[PDB]
């Protein structure tokens, strides 16, 4: 695989060294059995006690030496291939912060968990154990069978019968499970998706459908059907391989052809000593690749799947390369190919002016804020902050110049202080409190059990109108020259909405503000009201001018009073 081999290229030299050292280790491990054959052959000859003991000691030391060298490789090779995962996982988290957010919405948090954590974990066998198991599974059976074939070819061929049978089981097991292993990561993502949706959308599951009718139960039963149909012949072949390559199976097969040769005048019993001691040793090494070839397939797919993400197009910062000004110049954007969401929008936001972006729901007013944030790149046109294109501005220079409220109270799992101080985590606790008071949420937070240190994860959340005020306080603390309020105070009552509106007007007197609102009664004081219908700006002007013009804004205003 071009993408699979390209990912694991840095581990070329460590893996080649692992293969060579395993060749030496496997020969060191077979060495004491050859000495035991000589020691056993000396017992028949009745040699002196000292002669037998020297073969015993040099066999014990080689057992110790082989174990030291074997443990030196595995300890080294796991550290090398655990640092690779940390390097690889750091690359993914760096990659994901640069992709457009269309990537995140079409995959979700369940597939990103699969990528960063599960897929990088699936590489573990492919690098730590694949080459040691592949080299030991060929060095030792070939080394033994070459030794035993010189000893006696008759019993060597008999011992070779289970070798061929094991290869047949290994091949049919691998090809049959090949199709299922390809489908396995897909099911894990989908099952991971339902588990996230089932646990997150619990109020929906409880009231609508309940436990029985939930889609999680349906797909859970479907997944276990996949595992049963996958793991049934897989485990069925794995047990047969374990029986064929068991030490007792070789020892029986040796004696099936050994006893008739010893009983008849066709083999001296001394020539069985190599088989009884060496013939059974390589059963557990052949089994290493039988159980591994499935683990290589998951690793190679995971490497292919990881490298594909690392080759995704990014939000590249161009090399091309008034304060507080944002300009949209014939912007046009499409979330999907051939589905225009924004069409030829031209809009200039100047300092000290509050621009009010209104219109029908689903018109495109939130995606315009997304384009300004550069969560997505405009398909046409350009967006320029202070004369610098957002595509030329780096992430720091862009998000230090523009601050956002995103219509969703996306609170992080952390203290109340940290959710307010997400922009600048080293913000002083007094600065956090002043931001919270401006959002009219300091009084709420003081009443919580732990104050500003209280955790705001799932099951310890706030009310819907208060989790939004936390994000308003976050934006206030960030305090960028350009602010983009995507329907802040949607869930706020009139009293709190008016108070936070007064606070924001106090804060952003000499700043650019793009306020998005469906409550038009708070929009009447905007310097310019921009009406966005079907992604195109259909009319621009002040409140009185729009009412006099009598268009879509007049329709919305009349329908507002009901």
């Amino acid at each position: 695989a071009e993408a699979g081999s390209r990912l694991l290229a840095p581990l070329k030299k460590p893996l080649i060294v692992s293969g060579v050292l395993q060749a030496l280790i496997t020969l060191i491990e077979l060495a004491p059995f050859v000495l035991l054959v000589e020691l056993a052959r000396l017992l028949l000859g009745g040699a002196e006690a000292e002669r037998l003991w020297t073969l015993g000691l040099t066999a014990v030391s080689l057992i110790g030496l082989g174990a030291v060298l074997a443990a030196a490789m595995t300890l080294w090779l796991h550290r090398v291939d655990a640092r690779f995962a940390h390097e690889l996982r750091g690359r993914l988290l760096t990659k994901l912060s640069r992709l457009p957010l269309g990537w995140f919405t079409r995959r979700g948090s369940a597939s990103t968990k699969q990528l960063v954590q599960d897929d990088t974990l699936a590489l573990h066998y492919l690098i730590t154990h694949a080459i040691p198991d592949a080299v030991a599974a060929v060095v030792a059976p070939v080394a033994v069978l070459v030794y035993l074939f010189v000893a006696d070819w008759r019993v060597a061929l008999v011992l070779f019968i289970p070798v061929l049978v094991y290869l047949v089981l290994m091949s049919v097991m691998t090809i049959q499970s090949g199709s299922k292993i390809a489908q396995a990561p897909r099911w894990a993502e989908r099952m991971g998706g339902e588990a996230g949706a089932f646990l997150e959308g619990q109020p929906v599951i409880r009231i609508f459908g309940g436990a029985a009718a939930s889609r999680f139960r349906r797909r859970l039963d479907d997944y276990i059907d996949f595992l049963v149909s996958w793991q049934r012949p897989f485990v069925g072949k794995k047990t047969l391989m374990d029986l064929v390559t068991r030490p007792a199976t070789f020892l029986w097969i040796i004696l099936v052809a050994g006893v008739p040769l010893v009983v008849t005048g066709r083999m001296d019993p001394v020539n069985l000593l190599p088989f009884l001691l060496l013939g059974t040793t390589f059963g557990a090494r052949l089994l290493g690749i039988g159980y591994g070839l499935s683990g290589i397939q998951t690793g190679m797919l995971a490497a292919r799947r990881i490298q594909t993400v690392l080759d995704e197009p990014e939000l590249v910062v161009r090399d091309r390369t008034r304060p507080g000004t944002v300009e949209l110049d014939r912007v046009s954007f499409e979330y999907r190919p051939g589905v225009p969401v924004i069409r030829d929008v031209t809009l200039t936001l100047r300092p000290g002016t509050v621009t009010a972006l209104v219109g029908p729901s689903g018109s495109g007013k939130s995606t315009l804020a997304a384009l300004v944030a550069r969560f997505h790149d405009v398909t046409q046109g350009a967006i320029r902050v202070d004369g610098r294109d957002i595509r030329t501005l780096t992430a720091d220079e862009l998000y230090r110049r523009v601050g956002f409220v995103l219509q969703d109270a996306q609170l992080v799992h952390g203290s109340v202080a940290e959710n307010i101080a997400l922009a600048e985590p080293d913000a002083g606790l007094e600065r956090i409190r002043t931001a919270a008071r401006d959002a009219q949420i300091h009084d709420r937070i003081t009443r919580m059990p732990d104050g500003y240190d209280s955790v705001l994860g799932a099951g310890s959340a706030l009310s819907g109108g208060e989790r939004q005020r936390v994000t308003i306080a976050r934006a206030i603390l960030a305090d960028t020259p350009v602010l983009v309020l995507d329907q802040a105070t949607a869930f706020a009552d009139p009293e709190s909405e008016y108070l936070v509106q007064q606070a924001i007007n106090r804060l952003t007197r000499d700043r650019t503000v793009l306020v998005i609102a469906h409550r038009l009664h708070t929009i009447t004081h905007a310097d310019q009201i921009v009406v966005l219908d079907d992604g195109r700006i259909v009319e621009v002007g002040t409140h009185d001018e729009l009412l006099a013009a009598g268009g879509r804004y007049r329709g919305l205003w009349d329908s507002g009073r009901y």
Binding site: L96, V412, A490
Partner: protein
């Protein structure tokens, strides 16, 4: 293991008993298979090798019987492995909807998500991969050890002592890495939680410049995960080499004893050579146990998380069916009190709502007016007092009858990853297509079908993230209107809707065909138009109530509420 056996289905315990017999039979045949070699080889190297034919016969018979048992023990081990898996995962899936909402703390949701995430094949083979080699290698090396007492007592006693030290070494390996594997699991679990947050709240993090690994919270989770990951290997591999080496030290030791007894004349040379060969059967079972320490701890961890979910506090319930099965029930509170942890939400809240009429709830944010709709729907339950649906206490209602008596439009509308029509159909999957279009048409979802390319097949993202804020709100409204329940709870269903769609939706909510008892929460006066009754809640208590016109004329807090 005691937690493991109880998770089996009651019907499957017959296979559990059969599995134990074949597991004892398999070990007994394997030990007997090793015993039959000593007469065989000792006869083979003797002057009359023809005696080997008899002892070869019993070895082949025991060997074939060993293969038959081992294949069948795998089939029962496979069946028991998935019987536990399918039973536990179905029990967890059926248990979580009934578990109390307060149980889902950020840590508990992590274990519940991890416990659900253990559905893969690693836990499916908890019997075949882990128990069978473990039990086979706990009884067989001792079975060979006791069998050697009838050939040489010093060698047979050494074999039994070998099992003692080898298992003792395994215990020390587990005790050493138990602390490190506790930290490894927690830091590996926290990394999963932060990846979910990283990909779920990406918009908030990016605007906050909190996405680089050098400053992100997932970056710290990865760094902590790596440190605990390496620290586990440092305290784990020395455990495995000591066990693996001690296994080889024990084997060569006994092969040394067999030689040494031969030198002293206590053991014949043919019998000594037979014992040297057969003693590989002593280390064969212990070889499998060497690498199962990581598997044993992971399997122990998952079964603890599974049992944690099955120990979760199920919500209280009864078996009373709703009296007004068809008609509109009369919702009422009787000194209903409620509190999240320590903070008091409701204190002395008592109101009675007539059947079939529409009632509005208004008040400052944080008042507790989403909690009122939660208690009526049964998502929450009072600490004291009782909610009555037509004189029937909700706590005593059958949970099947409890959910069928309420439909809710949640404040933060959540949709599942799937087509637009699928999310509308979860309200009533048995509904006729005419009823689905009627609900979508009423909730103004037909506007989305006209605009969107796919119509009612647009693949919504996780939540409603592949739809606008008002598009997922109208899909939520259509979902609730489709459900035929005689109670409709509306929790700010017009927040993210323009004046054009808000006015139309408000008409649909208050003028749908069938009768219902409608409770409405909203922060916009146009969203509670022509409502029969109002409930103003400020401090968690209903300050005042009545008609809209009466309250406006009265000039109380309701009049000041919309003054601005």
């Amino acid at each position: 293991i005691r937690t493991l056996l109880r998770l089996v289905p009651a019907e499957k315990r017959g296979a559990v008993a059969g599995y134990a017999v074949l597991t004892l039979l398999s070990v007994l045949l394997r030990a007997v298979g090793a015993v039959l070699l000593i007469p065989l080889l000792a006869a083979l190297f003797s002057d009359t090798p023809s005696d080997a034919w008899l002892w070869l016969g019993w070895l082949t018979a025991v060997t074939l019987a060993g293969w038959v048992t081992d294949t069948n023990t795998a089939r029962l081990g496979f069946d028991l492995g998935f019987a536990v898996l399918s039973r536990t995962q179905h029990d967890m899936a059926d248990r979580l909807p009934n578990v109390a909402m307060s149980w889902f703390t950020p840590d508990n949701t992590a274990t519940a998500r991890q416990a659900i995430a253990a559905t893969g094949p690693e836990l499916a083979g908890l019997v075949v991969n882990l128990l069978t080699p473990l039990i086979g290698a706990a009884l067989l090396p001792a079975a060979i050890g006791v069998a050697l007492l009838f050939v040489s007592v010093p060698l047979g006693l050494a074999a039994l002592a070998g099992v003692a030290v080898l298992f003792g070494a395994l215990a020390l390996s587990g005790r050493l890495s138990r602390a490190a594997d506790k930290v490894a699991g927690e830091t590996n679990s926290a990394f999963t939680e932060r990846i979910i947050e990283f990909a779920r709240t990406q918009q908030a993090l990016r605007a906050a410049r909190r996405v680089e690994p050098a400053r992100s919270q997932v970056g710290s989770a990865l760094a902590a995960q790596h440190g605990a990951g390496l620290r586990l290997l440092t305290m784990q591999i020395p455990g495995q080499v000591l066990f693996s080496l001690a296994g080889q030290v024990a084997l060569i030791g006994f092969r040394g004893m067999a030689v040494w007894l031969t030198v002293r004349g206590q053991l014949g040379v043919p019998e000594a050579i037979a014992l040297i060969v057969v003693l590989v059967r002593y280390l064969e079972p212990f070889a499998a146990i060497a690498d199962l320490a990581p598997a044993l701890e992971t399997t122990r961890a998952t079964l603890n998380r599974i049992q944690a979910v099955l120990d979760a506090p199920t919500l209280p319930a009864g078996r009373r069916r709703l009296d007004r099965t068809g008609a509109a029930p009369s919702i009422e509170f009787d000194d209903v009190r409620f509190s999240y942890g320590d903070e008091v939400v409701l204190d002395g809240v008592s109101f009675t709502l007539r059947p079939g009429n529409t009632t509005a709830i208004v008040g400052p944010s944080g008042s507790g007016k989403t909690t009122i709709l939660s208690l009526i729907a049964g998502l929450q339950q009072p600490a004291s007092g009782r909610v009555l649906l037509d004189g029937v206490d909700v706590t005593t209602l059958d949970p099947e009858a409890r959910r069928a008596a309420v439909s809710v439009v949640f404040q933060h509308p959540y949709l599942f990853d799937g087509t637009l029509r699928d999310n509308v159909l979860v309200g009533d999957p048995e509904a006729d297509p005419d009823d689905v279009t009627a609900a979508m048409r009423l909730a103004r979802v037909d506007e989305l079908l006209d605009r969107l390319p796919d119509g009612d097949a647009t693949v919504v993202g996780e939540g409603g993230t592949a739809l606008s804020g008002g598009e997922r709100q109208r899909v939520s409204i259509a979902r609730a209107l489709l459900k035929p329940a005689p109670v409709l709870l509306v929790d700010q269903a017009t927040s993210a809707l323009d004046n054009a769609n808000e006015a139309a939706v408000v008409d649909a909510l208050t003028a749908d065909p069938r009768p219902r008892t409608r409770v409405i929460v909203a922060h916009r006066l146009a969203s509670i138009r022509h409502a029969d009754r109002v409930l103003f809640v400020e401090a968690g208590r209903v300050v005042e109530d009545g008609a809209i016109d009466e309250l406006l004329a009265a000039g109380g807090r309701f009049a000041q509420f919309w003054a601005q």
